[PDB]
């Protein structure tokens, strides 16, 4: 539940990723018969739905103010990873806190007889 | 230890006939199965591996066949030097169990 | 990427939608990545055919992966090779790379071609084992070792020593291109096909022994079939 | 039948440098085991031998200018060439390209290039 | 500066189908995603629909009965709605002006046109 | 380092005292760490008001991080700038550095001044977008891309052939530095302000 | 369960490894008295045992397309790890799912009483 | 409960961090107006409470065995990880055991009556 | 890698057969592999000791590993040491090491010797420290920082501007080697033992003033030990 950034956000994400999902020949998933570098990217264009991609850039403004401070902080170079810390942290908020049912963890089912 | 069998006990053919050759095993083993062909007095060769596929310098008128506990053993058009001793056996590990054996019978 | 379980005495691969307790990841150790000798696919080992498998392409730039333990390889090649104008073929090998830590023979090739394209490319997308590094390109210099990788769930001095075969190469990248066993200064024998290394090192039964030894200023290179050494068949 | 082809410098001042070349118009160079090398003849001596070139790369010089001759090749253009440090009026001769002849037995080089001179002054 | 081209008014017998035209006054257009909005008889704006200008793809108001046909001609700058069914009572300003969700972006069609029925 | 879930049509800070299952991580590839376009903000993309946002600093060495790719930027940089003694300027980009891949304006400049700094650095903080590789420094050769990452928890050749306006600098390190598009070997168009790369582009009708 | 290549696999896996439980003397484990670089690797030999090897080659066959596919996906020049994240996949995938008892999770134990 | 170093503590460990608890100023946070790169440090100095410091170099000691060990084995120039690893495995040997009650894990409540 | 944990205020091994939910991992943040100065282990801090503390080797490749926060160094080194032939000795440090960020008294050294090995190495496997990376070779340039690492699990212009002592080497990586401290163009000090940095800085009252100064051209060598500053005995 987070407000939209003030700045005037672009209403449409004209957007790429690295993602192209599956193989439909196995040469294109050999790297010798591999595509141009830059055909490995795909592309569509997001809408605001729901308000999303406004209060996206704000989460980005936001998150940047702790990101950059961590990065000074860092030791590594080029910092490949985070994102997989941050499920690794996911999991650690997750667990060692005491849980049967009556705990605000674990998902539990309701009891059955 | 698996176990395995082979059938018929022999099988009589005319030259040129087109035969086969079953055989059985206790367990299911992903088709890890071989068969071997030799004339009296001499070495088994082995013919065909996991189940399916044959050895090099097998004629073609040799195929494997099946899978897991049932598979067999076809020969079109049999030469008179195929009659022969022949088996089966295990390669998923150990021990490497062998057909009841089975023998061609000239007509 | 799937994974293989073992369990039940076969492998299982991973990529299902239940994850069943009966096997336990207790701990990260189980995994694995292991590499595979390619050759043990029953994969030709003939230098040509190594030619014949590689792509010689330019590319998109080369990426090479962590990875586990794994069986020897008997076969595996060293390279040298430049283009025609004498500039460098192929990367050089990235620091820290050396070669696969038990093959039984490394063929090595050096001269010069064409050496078509920037990265090569298995055409398999066979990876070469450098060391604990596969890669998707050719190296310079360490050895290639062609291979493939698995990823796994878990429940003397010849193992380094051993190293046959060095040759010149007539162009390269392309099937034209010829390979020359060398041994004592002396360049012979394109190697056919079907030679195994312990052929080829039967051939030194040639050497200060049976034929060959030019009696020169230097080598003369016999062509390749007594029929088999060629002797005085160097044209 | 190689259009061997003779490179080289003009008159030069002595105590100076220079660099030959010879080129194979009508031979690639291709083959293994083809040599190539030079030799000169100065004042109508004999082959004083120069240089000797294979395109399975191996070189060799005459040890007596050694010292002052190194050895280049390009395969892609059928290329050979010798940079002579300290050019004077000793090594004023003709010079020659040479190719083996009979070709990868016996060496027999043998076949030559037109032939070309370098003088001094 | 973005300004909205069309046709004049027109009068159609019942059942008509119109294909509504508009066109952009410049390059701008090829990121609008361009929208449709309506006024029956002078009545408070509907959204219709809208295209996107890159790919043609297309939403629409479900309230809007019939949809609308909707293409684009990103090579002409131009795009389209078509009306379909048509009644005296679906008379209405059309507009192919872009209700942008910021003011980062707008666009709005001031031609006047009215399509209407008898 | 917080990140936004994505639920109830809305996103939702990540920093919570309960991880409600309400949205599952299935899997680590409903992570995301997507780069966005500083000029989806309405930021100016005038090519000195880059040089304005550049801090021109000596500093802390140069750190990229690796993140989600994005969307298309209309506007982005290339610098082959060298202080006026031919020095360079501004690290090289290094091995696996690229610029970013969907840039519609890929702008670019040359020629030589003061360039202070050495890490340049953003002044918004900002981070330069290359490919997949987020900068605190602006690399040599290689577009730029201006950009901030968001994280995020989940539930054809003219896409980058489209690129215009290649610039001279005079002076730089400064936004007293001036900026001249080259056409046709001609040096000319001070691109001070409100020149979109297609007002420019249209500046071709005099060659 | 899984079909073997129908490669002609070899029978063998003569192998080596890095591996080198423990630490006979301290000296060992300095890096001043350190094995030779190859020396660290250890070597032993494994056969196929049960059809695995084959199985193993079929599996590394289809792996070199979805890790090569990956692999262009990656954007580390070295990609030293892959099964870290496979392994908080295993726990991304075994949990957060309601569970109780009557869920198809957790590896419920017998009820006591 | 491990004992103390036999090597003679010193107890007072002046130190230094990276840490830097909040941002008084966005221009903190932002490179270009960061401070300079030893200003990320922080100091203050431990005092050996609960006999901890001289038991910390014991670990260190046997600790460079283990680690250098396990550098060994590594095959990353840099080893910029590790503690996530071992948040893993302290996960893994938490997660995927059976577990109503009667296992010794998952923290388990006490029974509602 | 057993790891230690605090817990009922003292260190525990984290290699148990039970994770006892006493202690919640609740964060990746109380992970710890802080460093720690060798020196607070009671270990000399000679300069020859220093030496004898290095295994001057050719060896395996150097790794670094990254590391924690931790205590100053009273004492650190950095070298500009190269071979009698003035080839260079010991890698330089790799892009983006530095110093380790508090060293209060880092020792330098120059001048050649033999500078036996490679990566040198540290005779008990002690990390050298820069920065935040532990190292097992010495590099070039950078301070040394000698120490250890543990690994736990958690439940002012001076502090850059200090440092001292900079000497020359005659020889390296051997027991023959010796320092010589170097202050105002004089070199003097072999620094032969139980010589603080600051029993070293209390000798800069001879700076034109309590002895030495010579009225020469340069520098004579004086011999540390009036008695001490060896007055005139440079030979
Ligand atoms: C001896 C040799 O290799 N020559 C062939 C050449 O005749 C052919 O045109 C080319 C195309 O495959 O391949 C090669
Ligand atoms: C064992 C032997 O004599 N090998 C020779 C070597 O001495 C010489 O340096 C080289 C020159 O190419 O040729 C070969
Ligand atoms: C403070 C002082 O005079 N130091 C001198 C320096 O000027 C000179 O460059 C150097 C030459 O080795 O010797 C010392």
Same mark, same amino acid.
């Given at each position: 539940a987070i407000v939209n950034a003030?700045?005037?956000?672009?209403?449409?994400?004209?957007?790429?990723?690295?993602?192209?999902?599956?193989?439909?020949?196995?040469?294109?998933?050999?790297?010798?018969?591999?595509?141009?570098?830059?055909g490995i990217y795909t592309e569509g264009l997001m809408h605001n739905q729901d308000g999303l991609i406004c209060g996206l850039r704000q989460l980005a403004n936001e998150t940047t103010q702790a990101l950059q401070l961590f990065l000074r902080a860092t030791t590594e170079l080029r910092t490949f990873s985070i994102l997989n810390r941050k499920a690794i942290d996911f999991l650690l908020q997750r667990w060692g806190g005491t849980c049967h049912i009556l705990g605000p963890d674990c998902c539990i089912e309701p009891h059955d007889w | 230890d698996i176990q395995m069998t082979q059938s018929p006990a022999s099988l009589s053919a005319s030259v040129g006939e087109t035969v086969t050759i079953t055989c059985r095993a206790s367990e299911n083993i992903y088709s890890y199965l071989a068969w071997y062909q030799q004339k009296q007095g001499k070495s088994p060769q082995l013919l065909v591996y996991n189940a399916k596929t044959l050895i090099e310098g097998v004629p073609s008128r040799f195929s494997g066949s099946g899978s897991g506990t049932q598979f067999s053993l076809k020969i079109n058009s049999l030469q008179p030097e195929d009659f022969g001793s022949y088996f089966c056996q295990h390669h998923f590990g150990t021990p490497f169990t062998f057909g009841s054996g089975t023998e061609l019978e000239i007509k | 990427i799937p994974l293989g379980v073992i369990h039940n005495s076969t492998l299982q691969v991973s990529d299902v939608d239940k994850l069943v307790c009966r096997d336990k990841l207790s701990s990260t150790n189980q995994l694995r990545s292991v590499g595979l000798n390619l050759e043990g696919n029953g994969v030709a080992t003939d230098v040509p055919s190594a030619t014949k498998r590689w792509g010689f392409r330019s590319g998109v730039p080369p990426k090479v992966v962590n990875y586990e333990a794994g069986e020897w390889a008997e076969n595996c090649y060293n390279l040298e090779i430049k283009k025609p104008d004498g500039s460098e073929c192929l990367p050089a090998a990235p620091d820290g790379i050396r070669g696969f830590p038990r093959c039984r023979y490394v063929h090595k090739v050096s001269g010069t071609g064409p050496c078509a394209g920037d990265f090569a490319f298995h055409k398999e997308g066979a990876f070469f084992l450098y060391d604990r590094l596969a890669s998707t390109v050719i190296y310079r210099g360490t050895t290639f070792a062609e291979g493939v990788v698995a990823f796994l769930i878990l429940p003397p001095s010849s193992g380094y020593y051993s190293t046959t075969i060095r040759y010149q190469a007539t162009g390269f990248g392309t099937n034209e291109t010829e390979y020359l066993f060398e041994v004592?200064?002396?360049?012979?024998?394109?190697?056919?096909?079907?030679?195994?290394?312990?052929? /080829?090192?039967? /051939?030194?039964?040639?050497?200060?022994?049976?034929?060959?030894?030019?009696?020169?200023?230097?080598? /003369?290179?016999?062509?390749?079939?007594?029929?088999?050494?060629?002797?005085?068949?160097?044209? | 039948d190689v259009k061997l082809l003779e490179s080289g410098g003009g008159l030069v001042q002595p105590g100076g440098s220079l660099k030959l070349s010879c080129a194979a118009s009508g031979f690639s160079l291709s083959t293994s085991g083809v040599g190539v090398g030079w030799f000169r003849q100065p004042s109508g001596k004999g082959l004083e031998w120069l240089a000797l070139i294979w395109w399975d790369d191996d070189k060799y010089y005459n040890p007596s200018l050694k010292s002052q001759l190194s050895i280049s090749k390009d395969f892609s253009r059928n290329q050979v060439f010798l940079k002579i440090s300290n050019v004077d009026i000793a090594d004023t001769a003709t010079y020659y390209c040479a190719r083996r002849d009979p070709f990868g037995y016996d060496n027999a080089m043998g076949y030559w290039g037109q032939g070309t001179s370098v003088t001094v002054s | 500066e973005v300004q909205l081209q069309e046709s004049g008014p027109e009068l159609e017998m019942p059942g008509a189908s119109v294909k509504i035209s508009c066109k952009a006054s410049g390059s701008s257009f090829t990121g609008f995603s361009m929208n449709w909005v309506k006024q029956s008889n002078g009545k408070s704006l509907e959204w219709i629909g809208n295209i996107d200008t890159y790919y043609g793809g297309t939403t629409y108001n479900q309230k809007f009965k019939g949809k609308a046909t909707l293409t684009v001609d990103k090579s002409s700058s131009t795009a389209y709605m078509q009306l379909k069914s048509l009644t005296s009572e679906d008379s209405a300003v059309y507009y192919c002006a872009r209700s942008a969700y910021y003011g980062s972006t707008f666009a709005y069609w001031g031609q006047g046109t009215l399509v209407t029925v008898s």
């Open positions: 003030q700045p005037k956000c672009n209403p449409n994400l004209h957007y790429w990723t690295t993602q192209d999902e599956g193989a439909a020949i196995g040469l294109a998933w050999i790297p010798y018969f591999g595509p141009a570098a830059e | - | 004592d200064n002396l360049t012979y024998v394109q190697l056919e096909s079907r030679f195994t290394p312990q052929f /080829l090192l039967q /051939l030194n039964e040639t050497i200060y022994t049976s034929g060959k030894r030019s009696n020169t200023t230097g080598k /003369l290179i016999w062509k390749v079939n007594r029929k088999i050494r060629s002797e005085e068949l160097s044209f | - | -």
